[PDB]
Coordinates of C-alpha atoms in Angstrom, one line a residue:
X1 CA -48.8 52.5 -26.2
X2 CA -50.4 50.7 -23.5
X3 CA -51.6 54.3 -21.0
X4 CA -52.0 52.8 -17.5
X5 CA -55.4 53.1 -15.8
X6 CA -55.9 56.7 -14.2
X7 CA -53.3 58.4 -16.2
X8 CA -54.9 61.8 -17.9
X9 CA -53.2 62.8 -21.4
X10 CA -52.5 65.8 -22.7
X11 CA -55.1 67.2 -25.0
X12 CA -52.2 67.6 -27.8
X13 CA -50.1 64.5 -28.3
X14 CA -47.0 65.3 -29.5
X15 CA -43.2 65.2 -29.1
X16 CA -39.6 66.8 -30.0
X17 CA -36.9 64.0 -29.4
X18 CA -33.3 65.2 -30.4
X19 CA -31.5 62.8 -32.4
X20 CA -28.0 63.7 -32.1
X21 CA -27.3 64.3 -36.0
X22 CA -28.7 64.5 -39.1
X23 CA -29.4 61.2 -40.5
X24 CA -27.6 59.3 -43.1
X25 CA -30.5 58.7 -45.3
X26 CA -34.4 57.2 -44.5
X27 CA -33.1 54.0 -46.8
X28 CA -33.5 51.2 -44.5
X29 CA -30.6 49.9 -46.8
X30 CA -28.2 52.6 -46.7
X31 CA -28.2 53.4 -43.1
X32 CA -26.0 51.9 -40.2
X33 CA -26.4 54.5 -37.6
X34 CA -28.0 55.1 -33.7
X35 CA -29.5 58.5 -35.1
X36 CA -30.7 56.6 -38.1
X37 CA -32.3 53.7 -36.2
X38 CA -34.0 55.8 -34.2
X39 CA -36.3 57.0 -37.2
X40 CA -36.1 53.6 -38.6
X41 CA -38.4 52.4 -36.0
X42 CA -41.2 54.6 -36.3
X43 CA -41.2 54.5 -40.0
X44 CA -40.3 50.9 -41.3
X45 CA -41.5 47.8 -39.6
X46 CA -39.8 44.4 -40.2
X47 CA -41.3 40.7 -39.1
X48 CA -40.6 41.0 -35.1
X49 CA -40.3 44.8 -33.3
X50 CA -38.9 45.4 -29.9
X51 CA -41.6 45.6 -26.8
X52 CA -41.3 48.8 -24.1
X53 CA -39.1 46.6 -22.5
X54 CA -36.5 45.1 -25.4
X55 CA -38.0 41.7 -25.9
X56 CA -38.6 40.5 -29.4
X57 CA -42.2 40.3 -29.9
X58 CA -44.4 40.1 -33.0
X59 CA -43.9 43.2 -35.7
X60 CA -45.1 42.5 -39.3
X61 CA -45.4 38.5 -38.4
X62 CA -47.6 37.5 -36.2
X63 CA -46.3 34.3 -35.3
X64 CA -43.2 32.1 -36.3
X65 CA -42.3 28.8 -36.1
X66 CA -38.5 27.0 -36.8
X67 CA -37.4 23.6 -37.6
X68 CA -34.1 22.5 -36.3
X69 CA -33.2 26.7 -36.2
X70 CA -32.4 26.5 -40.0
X71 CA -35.8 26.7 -41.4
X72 CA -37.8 29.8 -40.5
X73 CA -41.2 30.5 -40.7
X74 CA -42.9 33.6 -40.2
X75 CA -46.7 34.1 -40.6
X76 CA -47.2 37.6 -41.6
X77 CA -50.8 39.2 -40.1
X78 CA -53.3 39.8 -42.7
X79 CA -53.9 43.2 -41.9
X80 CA -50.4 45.0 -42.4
X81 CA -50.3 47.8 -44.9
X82 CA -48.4 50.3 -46.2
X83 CA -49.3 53.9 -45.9
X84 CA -51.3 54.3 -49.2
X85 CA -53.1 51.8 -48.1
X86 CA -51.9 48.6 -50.0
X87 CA -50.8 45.2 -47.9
X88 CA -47.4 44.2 -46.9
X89 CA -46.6 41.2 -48.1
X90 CA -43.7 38.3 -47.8
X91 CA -43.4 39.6 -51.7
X92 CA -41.9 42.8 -49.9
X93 CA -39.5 41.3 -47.6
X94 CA -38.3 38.8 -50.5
X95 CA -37.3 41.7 -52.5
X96 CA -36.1 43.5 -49.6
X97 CA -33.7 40.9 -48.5
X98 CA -32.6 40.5 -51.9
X99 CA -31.9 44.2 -52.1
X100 CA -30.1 44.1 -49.0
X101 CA -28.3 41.2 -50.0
X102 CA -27.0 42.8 -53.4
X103 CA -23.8 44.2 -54.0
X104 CA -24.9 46.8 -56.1
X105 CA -27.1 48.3 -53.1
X106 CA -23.6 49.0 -51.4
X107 CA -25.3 48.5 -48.1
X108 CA -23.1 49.1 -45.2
X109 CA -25.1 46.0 -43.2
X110 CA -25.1 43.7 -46.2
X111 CA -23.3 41.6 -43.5
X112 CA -26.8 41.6 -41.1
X113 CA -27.4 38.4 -44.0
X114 CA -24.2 36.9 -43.0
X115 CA -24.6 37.1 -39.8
X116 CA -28.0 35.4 -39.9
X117 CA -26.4 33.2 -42.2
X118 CA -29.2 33.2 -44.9
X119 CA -28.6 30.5 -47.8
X120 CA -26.0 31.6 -50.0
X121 CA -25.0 35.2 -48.9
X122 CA -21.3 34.7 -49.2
X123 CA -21.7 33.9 -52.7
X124 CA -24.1 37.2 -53.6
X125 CA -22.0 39.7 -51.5
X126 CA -18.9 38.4 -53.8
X127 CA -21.1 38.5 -57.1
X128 CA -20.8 35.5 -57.5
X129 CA -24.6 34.2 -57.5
X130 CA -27.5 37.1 -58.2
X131 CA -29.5 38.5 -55.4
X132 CA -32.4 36.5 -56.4
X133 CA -30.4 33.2 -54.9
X134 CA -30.7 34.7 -51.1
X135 CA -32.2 31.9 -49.4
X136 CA -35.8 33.4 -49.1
X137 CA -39.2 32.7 -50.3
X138 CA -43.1 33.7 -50.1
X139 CA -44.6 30.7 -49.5
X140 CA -48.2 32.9 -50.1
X141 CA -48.8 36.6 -49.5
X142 CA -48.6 36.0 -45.9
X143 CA -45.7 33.6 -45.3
X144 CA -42.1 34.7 -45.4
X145 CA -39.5 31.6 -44.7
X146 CA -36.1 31.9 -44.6
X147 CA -33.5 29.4 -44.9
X148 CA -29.8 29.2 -43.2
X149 CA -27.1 27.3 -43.5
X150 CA -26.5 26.5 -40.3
X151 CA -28.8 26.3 -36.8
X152 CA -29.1 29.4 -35.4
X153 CA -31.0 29.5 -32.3
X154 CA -31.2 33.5 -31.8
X155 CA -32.2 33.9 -35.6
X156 CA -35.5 35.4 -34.3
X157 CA -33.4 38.4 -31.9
X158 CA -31.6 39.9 -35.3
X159 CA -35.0 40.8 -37.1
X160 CA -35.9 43.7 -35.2
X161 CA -33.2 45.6 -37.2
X162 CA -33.7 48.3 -39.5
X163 CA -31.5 46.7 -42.3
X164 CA -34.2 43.8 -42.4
X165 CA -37.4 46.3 -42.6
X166 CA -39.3 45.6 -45.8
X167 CA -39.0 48.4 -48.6
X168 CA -41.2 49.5 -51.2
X169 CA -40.2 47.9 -54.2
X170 CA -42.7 50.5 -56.5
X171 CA -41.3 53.9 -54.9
X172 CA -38.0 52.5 -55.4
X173 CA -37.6 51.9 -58.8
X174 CA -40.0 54.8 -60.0
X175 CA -38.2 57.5 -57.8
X176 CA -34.3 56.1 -57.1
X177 CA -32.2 57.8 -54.8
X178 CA -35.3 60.5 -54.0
X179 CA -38.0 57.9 -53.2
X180 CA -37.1 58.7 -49.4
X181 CA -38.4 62.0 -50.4
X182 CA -41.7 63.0 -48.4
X183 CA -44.1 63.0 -51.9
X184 CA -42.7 59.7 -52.6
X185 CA -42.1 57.5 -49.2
X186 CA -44.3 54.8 -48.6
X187 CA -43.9 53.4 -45.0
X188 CA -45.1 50.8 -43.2
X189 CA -44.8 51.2 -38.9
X190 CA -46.9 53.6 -37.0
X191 CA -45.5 56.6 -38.7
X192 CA -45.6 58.6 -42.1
X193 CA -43.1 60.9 -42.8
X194 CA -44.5 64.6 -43.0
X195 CA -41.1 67.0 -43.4
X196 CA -37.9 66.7 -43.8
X197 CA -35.3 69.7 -43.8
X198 CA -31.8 68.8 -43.9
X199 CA -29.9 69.7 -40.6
X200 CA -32.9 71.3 -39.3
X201 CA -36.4 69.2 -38.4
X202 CA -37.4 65.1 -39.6
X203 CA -41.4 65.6 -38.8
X204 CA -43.2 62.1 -38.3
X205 CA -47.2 62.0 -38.7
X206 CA -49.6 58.7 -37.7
X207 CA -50.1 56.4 -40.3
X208 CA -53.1 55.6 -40.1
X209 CA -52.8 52.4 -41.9
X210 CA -50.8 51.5 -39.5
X211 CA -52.2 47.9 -38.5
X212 CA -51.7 48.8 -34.4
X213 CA -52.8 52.2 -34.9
X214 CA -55.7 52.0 -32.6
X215 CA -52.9 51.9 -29.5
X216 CA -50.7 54.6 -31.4
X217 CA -51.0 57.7 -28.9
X218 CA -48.6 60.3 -30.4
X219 CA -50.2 61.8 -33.6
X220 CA -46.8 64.1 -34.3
X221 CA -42.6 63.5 -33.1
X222 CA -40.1 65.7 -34.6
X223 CA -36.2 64.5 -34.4
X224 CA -33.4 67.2 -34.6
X225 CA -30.1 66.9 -35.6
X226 CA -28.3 68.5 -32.8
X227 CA -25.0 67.0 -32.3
X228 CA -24.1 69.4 -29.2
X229 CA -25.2 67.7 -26.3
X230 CA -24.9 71.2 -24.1
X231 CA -27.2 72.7 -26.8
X232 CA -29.6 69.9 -26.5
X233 CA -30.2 70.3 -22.9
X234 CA -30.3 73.6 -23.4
X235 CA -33.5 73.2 -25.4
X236 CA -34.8 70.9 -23.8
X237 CA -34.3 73.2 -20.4
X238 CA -36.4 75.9 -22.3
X239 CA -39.1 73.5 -23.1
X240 CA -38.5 73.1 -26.7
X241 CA -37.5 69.1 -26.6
X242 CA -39.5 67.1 -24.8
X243 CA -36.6 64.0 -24.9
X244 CA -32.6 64.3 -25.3
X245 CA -30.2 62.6 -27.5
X246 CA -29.0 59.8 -25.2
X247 CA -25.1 61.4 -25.1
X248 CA -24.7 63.6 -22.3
X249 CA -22.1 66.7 -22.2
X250 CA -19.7 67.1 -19.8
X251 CA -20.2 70.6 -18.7
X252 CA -23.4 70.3 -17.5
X253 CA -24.2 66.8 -16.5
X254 CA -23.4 66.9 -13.0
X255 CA -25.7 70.3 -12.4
X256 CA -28.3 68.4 -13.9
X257 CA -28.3 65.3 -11.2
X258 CA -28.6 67.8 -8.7
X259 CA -30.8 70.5 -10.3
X260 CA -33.6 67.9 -11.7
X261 CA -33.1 64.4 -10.5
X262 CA -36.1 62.9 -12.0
X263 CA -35.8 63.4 -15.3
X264 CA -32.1 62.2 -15.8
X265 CA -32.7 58.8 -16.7
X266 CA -29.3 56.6 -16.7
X267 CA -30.2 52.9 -17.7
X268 CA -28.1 49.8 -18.7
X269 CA -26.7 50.1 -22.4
X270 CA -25.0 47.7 -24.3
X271 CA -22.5 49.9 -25.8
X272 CA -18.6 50.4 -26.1
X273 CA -16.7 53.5 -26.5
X274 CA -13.4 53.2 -27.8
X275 CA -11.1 54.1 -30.0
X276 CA -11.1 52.5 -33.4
X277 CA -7.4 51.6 -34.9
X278 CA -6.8 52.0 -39.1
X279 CA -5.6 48.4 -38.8
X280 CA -4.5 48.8 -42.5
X281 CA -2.8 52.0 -42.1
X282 CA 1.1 51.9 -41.3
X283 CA 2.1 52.4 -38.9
X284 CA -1.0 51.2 -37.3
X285 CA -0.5 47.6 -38.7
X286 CA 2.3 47.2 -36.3
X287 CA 0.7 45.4 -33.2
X288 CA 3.2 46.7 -30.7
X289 CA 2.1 50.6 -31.7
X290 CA -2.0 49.7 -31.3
X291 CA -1.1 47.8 -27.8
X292 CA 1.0 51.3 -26.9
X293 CA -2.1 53.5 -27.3
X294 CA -4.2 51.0 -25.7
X295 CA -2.4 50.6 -22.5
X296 CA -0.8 54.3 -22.1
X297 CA -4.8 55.5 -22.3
X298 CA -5.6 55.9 -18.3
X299 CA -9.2 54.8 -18.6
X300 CA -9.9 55.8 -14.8
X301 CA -9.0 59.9 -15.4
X302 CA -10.9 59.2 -18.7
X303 CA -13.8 57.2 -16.9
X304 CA -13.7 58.6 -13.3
X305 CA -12.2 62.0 -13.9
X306 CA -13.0 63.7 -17.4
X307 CA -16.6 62.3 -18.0
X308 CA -17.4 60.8 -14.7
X309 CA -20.9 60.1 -15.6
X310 CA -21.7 56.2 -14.3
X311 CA -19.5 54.4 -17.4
X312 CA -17.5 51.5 -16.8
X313 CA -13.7 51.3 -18.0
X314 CA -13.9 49.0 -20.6
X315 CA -10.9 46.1 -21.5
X316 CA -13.1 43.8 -24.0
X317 CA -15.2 45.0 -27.2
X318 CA -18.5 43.1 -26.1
X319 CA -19.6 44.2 -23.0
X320 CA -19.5 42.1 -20.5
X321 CA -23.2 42.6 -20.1
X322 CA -24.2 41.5 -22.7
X323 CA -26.8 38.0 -22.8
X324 CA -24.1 34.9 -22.9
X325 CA -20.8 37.1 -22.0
X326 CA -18.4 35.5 -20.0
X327 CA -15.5 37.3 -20.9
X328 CA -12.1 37.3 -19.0
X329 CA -10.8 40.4 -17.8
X330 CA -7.6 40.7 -19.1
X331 CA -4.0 41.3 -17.2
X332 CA -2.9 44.6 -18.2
X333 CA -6.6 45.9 -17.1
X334 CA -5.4 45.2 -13.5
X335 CA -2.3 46.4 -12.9
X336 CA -1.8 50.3 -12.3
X337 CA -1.5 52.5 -14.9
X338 CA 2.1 53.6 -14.3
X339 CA 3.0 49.9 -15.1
X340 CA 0.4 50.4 -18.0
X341 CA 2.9 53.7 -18.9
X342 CA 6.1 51.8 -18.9
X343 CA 5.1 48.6 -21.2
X344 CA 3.8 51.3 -23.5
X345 CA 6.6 53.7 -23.8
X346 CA 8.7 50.0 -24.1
X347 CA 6.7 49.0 -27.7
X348 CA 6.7 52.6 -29.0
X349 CA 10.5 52.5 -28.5
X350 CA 10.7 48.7 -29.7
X351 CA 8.6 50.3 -32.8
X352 CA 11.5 52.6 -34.0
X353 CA 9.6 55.8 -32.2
X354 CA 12.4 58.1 -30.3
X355 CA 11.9 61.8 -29.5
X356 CA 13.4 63.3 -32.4
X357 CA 11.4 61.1 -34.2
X358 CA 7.6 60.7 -32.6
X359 CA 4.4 59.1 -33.4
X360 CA 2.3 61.7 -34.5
X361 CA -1.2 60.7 -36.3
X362 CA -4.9 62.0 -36.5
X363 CA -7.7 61.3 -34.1
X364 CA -11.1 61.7 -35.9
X365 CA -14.2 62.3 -34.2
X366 CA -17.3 63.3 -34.6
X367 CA -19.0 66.4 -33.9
X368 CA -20.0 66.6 -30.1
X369 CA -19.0 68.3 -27.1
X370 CA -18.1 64.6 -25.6
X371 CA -16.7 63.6 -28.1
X372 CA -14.2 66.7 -28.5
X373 CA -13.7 67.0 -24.6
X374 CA -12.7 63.4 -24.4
X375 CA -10.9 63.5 -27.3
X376 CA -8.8 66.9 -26.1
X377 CA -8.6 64.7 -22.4
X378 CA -6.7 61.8 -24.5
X379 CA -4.6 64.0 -26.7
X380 CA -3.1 64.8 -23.6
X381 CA -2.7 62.0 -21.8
X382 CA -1.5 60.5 -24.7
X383 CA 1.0 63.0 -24.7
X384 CA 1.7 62.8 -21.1
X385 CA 2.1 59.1 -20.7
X386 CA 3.6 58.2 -24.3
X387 CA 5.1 61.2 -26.4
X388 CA 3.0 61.3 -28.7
X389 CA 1.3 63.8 -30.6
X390 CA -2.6 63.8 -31.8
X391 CA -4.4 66.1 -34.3
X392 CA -7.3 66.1 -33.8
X393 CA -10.1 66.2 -36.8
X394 CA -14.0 66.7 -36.6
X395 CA -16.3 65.8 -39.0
X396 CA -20.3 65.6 -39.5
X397 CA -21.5 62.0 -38.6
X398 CA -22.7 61.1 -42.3
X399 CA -19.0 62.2 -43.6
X400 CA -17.5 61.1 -40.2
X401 CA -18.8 56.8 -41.4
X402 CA -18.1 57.3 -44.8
X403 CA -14.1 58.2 -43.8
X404 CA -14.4 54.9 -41.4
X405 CA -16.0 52.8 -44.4
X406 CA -13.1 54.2 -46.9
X407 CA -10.4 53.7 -44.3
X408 CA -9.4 57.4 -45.0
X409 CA -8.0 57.8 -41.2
X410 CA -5.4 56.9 -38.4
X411 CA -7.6 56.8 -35.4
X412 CA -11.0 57.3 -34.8
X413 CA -13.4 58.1 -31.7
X414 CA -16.1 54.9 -31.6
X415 CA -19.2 53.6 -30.2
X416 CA -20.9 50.4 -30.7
X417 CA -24.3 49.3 -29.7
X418 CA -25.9 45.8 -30.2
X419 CA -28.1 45.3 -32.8
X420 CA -29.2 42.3 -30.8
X421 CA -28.4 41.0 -27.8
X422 CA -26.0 38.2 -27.9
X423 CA -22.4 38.5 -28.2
X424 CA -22.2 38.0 -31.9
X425 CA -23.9 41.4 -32.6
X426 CA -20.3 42.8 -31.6
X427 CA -18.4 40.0 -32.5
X428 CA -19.2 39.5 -36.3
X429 CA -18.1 43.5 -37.0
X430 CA -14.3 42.2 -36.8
X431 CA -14.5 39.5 -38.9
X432 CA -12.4 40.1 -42.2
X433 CA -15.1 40.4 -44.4
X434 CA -18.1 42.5 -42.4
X435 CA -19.2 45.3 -44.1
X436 CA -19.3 46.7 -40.4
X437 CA -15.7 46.0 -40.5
X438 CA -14.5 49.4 -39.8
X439 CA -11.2 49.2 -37.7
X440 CA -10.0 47.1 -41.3
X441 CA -9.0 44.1 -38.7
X442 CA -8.4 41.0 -40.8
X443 CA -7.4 37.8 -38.5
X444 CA -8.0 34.4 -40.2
X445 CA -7.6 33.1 -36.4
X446 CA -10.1 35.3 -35.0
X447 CA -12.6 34.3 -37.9
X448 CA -12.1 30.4 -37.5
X449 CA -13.1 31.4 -34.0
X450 CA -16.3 32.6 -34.7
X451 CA -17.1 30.5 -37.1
X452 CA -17.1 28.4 -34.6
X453 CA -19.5 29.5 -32.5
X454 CA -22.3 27.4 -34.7
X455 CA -20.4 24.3 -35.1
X456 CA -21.3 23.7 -31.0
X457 CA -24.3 23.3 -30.1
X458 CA -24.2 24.1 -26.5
X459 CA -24.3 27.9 -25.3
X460 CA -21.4 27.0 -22.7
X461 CA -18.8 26.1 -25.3
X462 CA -20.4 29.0 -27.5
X463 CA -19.9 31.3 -24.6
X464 CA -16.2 29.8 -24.1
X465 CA -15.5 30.7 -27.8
X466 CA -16.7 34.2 -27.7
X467 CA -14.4 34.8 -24.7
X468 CA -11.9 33.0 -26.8
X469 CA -12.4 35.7 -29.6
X470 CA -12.3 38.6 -27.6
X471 CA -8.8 37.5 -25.8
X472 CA -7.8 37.4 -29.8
X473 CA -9.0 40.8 -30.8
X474 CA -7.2 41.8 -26.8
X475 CA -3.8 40.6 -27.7
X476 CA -4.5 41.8 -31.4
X477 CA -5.1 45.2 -30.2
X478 CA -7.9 46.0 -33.0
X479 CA -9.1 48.6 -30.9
X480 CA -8.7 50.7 -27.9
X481 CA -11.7 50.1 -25.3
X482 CA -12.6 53.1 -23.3
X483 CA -15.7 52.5 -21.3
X484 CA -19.0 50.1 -21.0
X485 CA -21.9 53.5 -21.8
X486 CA -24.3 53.9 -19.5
X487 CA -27.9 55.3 -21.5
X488 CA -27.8 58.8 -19.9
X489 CA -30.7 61.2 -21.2
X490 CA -33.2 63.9 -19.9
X491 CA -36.8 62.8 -20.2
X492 CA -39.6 65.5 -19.3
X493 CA -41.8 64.2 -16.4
X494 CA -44.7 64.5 -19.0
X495 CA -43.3 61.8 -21.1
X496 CA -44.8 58.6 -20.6
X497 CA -43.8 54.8 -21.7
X498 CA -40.5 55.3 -21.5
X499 CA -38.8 52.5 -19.6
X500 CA -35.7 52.5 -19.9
X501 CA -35.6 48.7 -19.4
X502 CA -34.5 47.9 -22.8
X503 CA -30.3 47.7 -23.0
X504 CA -30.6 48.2 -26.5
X505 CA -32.8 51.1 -26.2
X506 CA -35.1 50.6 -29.7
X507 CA -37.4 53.3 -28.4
X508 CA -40.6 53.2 -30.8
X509 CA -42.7 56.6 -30.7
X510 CA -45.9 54.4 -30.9
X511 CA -45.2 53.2 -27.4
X512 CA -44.9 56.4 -25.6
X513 CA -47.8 59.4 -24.0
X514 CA -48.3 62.9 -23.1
X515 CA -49.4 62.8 -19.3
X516 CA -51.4 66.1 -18.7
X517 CA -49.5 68.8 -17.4

């Protein structure tokens, strides 16, 4: 943390951040999630890091160098340790790539290598070369380069991901599955891990090996799994959390405007809501029943109406926001919704759908009072506008991205936020083969597309692509968009560093003070 002149901290530095659920798992390798990203950063630290404000800046490497963006070159800082003590080293991330890289991990971003287009990934996600062909090397202890097949000028943006973040290849082969567990984690950012009690607490201490512990301000944050957002500013009302969950429920949000305007922070995000489409699943393979739910959905009741809490309606997957969007707005976006209505009702009737005989499916969601609230608002107007009939299913978030990842659903509630920002961060999830690939949305036209994208070497013709892919998963109907979010949370007055500048929001509890109070 970098405390401004004058400020005077708290005698006790510590913090209670809710986290929205409980976490998938502390495996930088097994996790995909916001909630589990969130303790990702304070625990595992990979070559770059995010700064208080969201630019890449140096992490484990101190500085980097590319030639023709194929050939990487990151210069790791002598200093870096683990918390028992013992250095990091490009030995790490080799391993750790490899593990991410391997089939046998099952990693849900195994894709993150794909993306980044390491040397030979296609080939050791299909088993068809071992893990230990990734294209990665330690050149010495401190020098980690990394070779793509392709130029890739915003290779530097993806590494601030958890997926990336070096493991420790000891604890993981003595303890398995339980090396997580707070005897046997080793970590490497500013934090330890202290407790952890399923559904209840996640306690983070200071590591002290940390190699920027000297401007490490917070010795103790606790993250909580509360997945009510009315219960979470409930507790944070009382005192109990110093920082909300960054989802914000609709029966109290507009008291809290009004009752305490500065601490309800509401900051640029780059994240969609929609709804995400079994593309696999009759009769959601039919393109004429994903464009009926799409259209009939009246985003401004949804938007304006229902939630009303500064999100945009939302016709494209990337947001339009994001660094190198030029996406174009789409027709059916502008006309009114009871032209919306009719075109809909048209396609459900063109898809065999009659009254006797209605379209009747699940919407899944996970547990939230948003999330339910919406998902009761567009049951109805589902119902209202098309005939059709939702039942509605909630599940706990771990459970709730296993059923996406087995493609055990119809329809399922959805948020995505960039991992980095560039349009591709959204864009590579729908290609066939991402293990991010969710919605199940296979279209060889929409790959060729992206592929694409690095076959130009100019950003306006990769910029024109990207648009071009986005009108392809648009009259594809992968997905329903719902809204652009907005990062809406309740941040005590006493909580200092927190910007809110960053889009992608990669807060890291090393950065942030307790002003006196």
């Amino acid at each position: 943390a970098d405390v401004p002149a004058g400020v005077q901290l708290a005698d006790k530095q510590t913090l209670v951040r809710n986290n929205g659920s409980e976490v998938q798992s502390l495996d930088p390798h097994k996790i995909e999630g916001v909630p589990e990203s969130n303790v990702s950063r304070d625990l595992f630290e990979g070559l770059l890091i995010s700064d208080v404000e969201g630019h890449p800046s140096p992490g484990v490497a101190e500085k980097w160098e590319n030639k023709d963006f194929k050939v990487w070159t990151f210069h790791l800082r002598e200093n870096a340790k683990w918390s028992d003590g013992t250095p990091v080293t490009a030995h790490d991330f080799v391993y750790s790539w490899q593990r991410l890289a391997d089939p046998n991990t099952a990693s849900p971003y195994a894709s993150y290598l794909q993306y980044g287009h390491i040397a030979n990934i296609d080939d050791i996600i299909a088993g068809k070369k071992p893990a230990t062909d990734l294209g990665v090397k330690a050149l010495d202890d401190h020098t980690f380069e990394v070779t793509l097949s392709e130029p890739v000028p915003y290779f530097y943006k993806l590494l601030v991901h958890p997926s990336v973040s070096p493991v420790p290849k000891s604890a993981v082969e003595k303890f398995g599955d339980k090396w997580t567990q707070p005897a046997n984690i080793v970590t490497n950012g500013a934090y330890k891990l202290k407790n952890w009690v399923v559904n209840e607490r996640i306690v983070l201490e200071r590591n002290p090996q940390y190699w920027d512990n000297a401007k490490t301000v917070i010795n103790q944050v606790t993250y909580l799994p509360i997945s009510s957002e009315v219960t979470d500013v409930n507790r944070y009302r009382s005192g109990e959390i110093d920082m909300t969950y960054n989802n914000m429920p609709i029966e109290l949000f507009q008291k809290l405007k009004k009752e305490i305007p500065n601490e309800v922070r509401v900051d640029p995000y780059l994240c969609t809501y929609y709804y995400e489409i079994n593309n696999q699943k009759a009769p959601f393979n039919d393109v004429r029943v994903r464009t009926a739910l799409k259209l009939a959905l009246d985003r401004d009741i949804i938007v304006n109406k229902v939630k009303n809490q500064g999100d945009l309606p939302a016709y494209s997957y990337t947001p339009p926001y994001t660094d190198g969007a030029k996406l174009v707005e789409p027709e059916w976006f502008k006309w009114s919704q009871q032209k919306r209505n009719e075109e809909a009702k048209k396609l459900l009737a063109e898809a065999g759908f009659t009254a006797d005989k209605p379209l009747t499916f699940d919407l899944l969601y996970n547990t939230s009072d948003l999330h339910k609230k919406l998902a009761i608002a567009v049951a109805s107007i589902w119902k209202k506008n098309l005939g059709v009939n939702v039942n509605l299913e909630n599940q706990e978030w771990k459970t709730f991205l296993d059923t996406r990842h087995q493609g055990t659903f119809d329809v399922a509630r959805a948020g995505w936020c960039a991992d980095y920002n560039e349009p591709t961060s959204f864009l590579n999830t729908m290609l066939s083969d991402s293990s991010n690939n969710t919605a199940h949305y296979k279209s060889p036209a929409f790959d060729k597309l992206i592929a694409d994208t690095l076959k130009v070497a100019d950003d306006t013709q990769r910029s024109e692509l990207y648009a071009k892919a986005e009108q392809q998963l648009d009259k594809d109907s992968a997905i329903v968009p719902v809204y652009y979010y907005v990062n809406a949370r309740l941040v005590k007055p006493w909580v200092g560093g927190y910007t809110g500048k960053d889009p992608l929001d990669n807060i890291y509890v090393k950065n942030l003070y307790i002003i006196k109070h």
